[PDB]
Amino acid sequence: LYKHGLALYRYDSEKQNVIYNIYAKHLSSNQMYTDAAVAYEMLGKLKEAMGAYQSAKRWREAMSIAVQKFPEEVESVAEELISSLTFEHRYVDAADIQLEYLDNVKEAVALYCKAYRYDIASLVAIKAKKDELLEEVVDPGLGEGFGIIAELLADCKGQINSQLRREEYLVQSVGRLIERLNQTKPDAVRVVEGLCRRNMREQAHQIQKNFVEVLDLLKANVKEIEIHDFPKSHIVDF
Amino acid sequence: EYLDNVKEAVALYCKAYRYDIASLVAIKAKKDELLEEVVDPGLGEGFGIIAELLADCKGQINSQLRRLREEYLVQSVGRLIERLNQTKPDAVRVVEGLCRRNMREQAHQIQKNFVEVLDLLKANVEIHDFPKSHIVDF
C-alpha cells in the first residue's frame, strides 16, 4: 500500500518524501532499478542511484551524477559499464564510453568494426589523426564481417533447399529465418559499400550475387507455404 | 564535435528529445548553467507540443466516433495509430525528464492522459502498451 500512501500526500510534499525512500527500497530488490534510481534522485540520494543506473544499463545517467559529484570514481565505474555492455552486444554505446571517457581510441574503432558502422570509425581515427587504424583494424573488421555474412548466406541457402524437400515445426522454421533476414538485410548494406570504398570489387560482388539469389529463391516458396526486396547498389551490379 | 559550440548543440537536443544526452554533454562540458538556461525551456516546449497533441487527437477521435454513427474517413483511423507509436519514444523521455527536474505535476499529467488516450481506443472497430513509471503512479 505504498501507492495508497503517497496519493493521500499528492499536494503535501513534506510527508511524501519518505515514502519515496522505502518503496524504491522495495524496488531496489526486485530488479526494476530505474524505479529505484529515479526515486532516489527525488530525495537527494544520488550515490544510491548511481549503482542502480549501473545495474540497469543507464550509463549516461550514472556518469552524469558521477562526474558532477564523485570525481574519484569516474574512472572505475565506467570501466565496469563496459563489462555489462561487452556481454550484451551493445558495442556502440560501449564505444561511446570508450571514446570520450576512457580515451582508448583504438579499441573503440574495433567495436564499430563489430557493429558495422565503419563510416563512424573512419571519421574518428582521422579526427584524432591516427590514420594507421584504417590499415590496422578497419580492414580486418571488414574481412571479419565479410565471412560472417557470407557463411550465413549459405546457411539460409542450404537449410531451405533441405526443407523444401520436406510439419508444424517446419512452418515455424520458414518464418523464423525471414525475420532474421530483414534484421541482417541493412547489416549487409554497410558491408557492400565499405568494401567498394576499399576496392574489394569481387567480394562486394560476391555478397550481392549471393544475397539476391537467396531472395529470388525465397519468393517462390512462401506463396506455396511479406518480402522486402533488397535495394541494389548501381556500381557493383552487373 | 567541430564548431566548439555547445549551446547550439544542446538546444538541438532539446528538440531531439535526447535530454538524457543533453544532461551528459553539458556536465562533461562543465557548463551546468545551461541546465537552467537551455534544458528547462526545452522541457516545457516538449511538454507544450506533446500535451497539445494528447488533447488534440483526443477530441478528433470523438468527432470521428460521432460523425460515424464516408470512405475517406477510414484512413483517419490508422493515421492516428501512425503518429501514436511515433511519439511514444518521445513521450517517455519527457515523463522521466520532468521527473529528473522534479516537475511531478506535469509529468503525471502526460502520463495519466496517455493511458487515458490509449484506453479510449478500446472499442477499436496492432496497438502497443505504454511502459508506465511506477513512481508517480497514484
Curated annotation (Swiss-Prot), chain B:
It is found in: Cytoplasm; Nucleus. Phosphorylation promotes the tRNA modification function of the elongator complex. Coiled coil: none annotated. Disruption phenotype: Loss of mcm5U (5-methoxycarbonylmethyl uridine) and ncm5U (5-carbamoylmethyl uridine) from tRNA. Belongs to the ELP1/IKA1 family. Present with 10500 molecules/cell in log phase SD medium. Homodimer; dimerization promotes ELP1/IKI3 stability and elongator complex formation. Component of the elongator complex which consists of ELP1/IKI3, ELP2, ELP3, ELP4, ELP5/IKI1 and ELP6. The elongator complex is composed of two copies of the Elp123 subcomplex (composed of ELP1/IKI3, ELP2 and ELP3) and two copies of the Elp456 subcomplex (composed of ELP4, ELP5/IKI1 and ELP6). The Elp123 subcomplex forms a two-lobed scaffold, which binds the Elp456 subcomplex asymmetrically. In the complex, ELP1/IKI3 interacts with ELP2. In each lobe, ELP2 is tightly sandwiched between ELP1/IKI3 and ELP3. Component of the elongator complex which is required for multiple tRNA modifications, including mcm5U (5-methoxycarbonylmethyl uridine), mcm5s2U (5-methoxycarbonylmethyl-2-thiouridine), and ncm5U (5-carbamoylmethyl uridine). The elongator complex catalyzes formation of carboxymethyluridine in the wobble base at position 34 in tRNAs. Functions as a gamma-toxin target (TOT); disruption of the complex confers resistance to Kluyveromyces lactis toxin zymocin (pGKL1 killer toxin). May also be involved in sensitivity to Pichia inositovora toxin. This is Elongator complex protein 1. It comes from Saccharomyces cerevisiae (strain ATCC 204508 / S288c). The chain holds residues 1105 to 1349 of 1349 of the full protein.
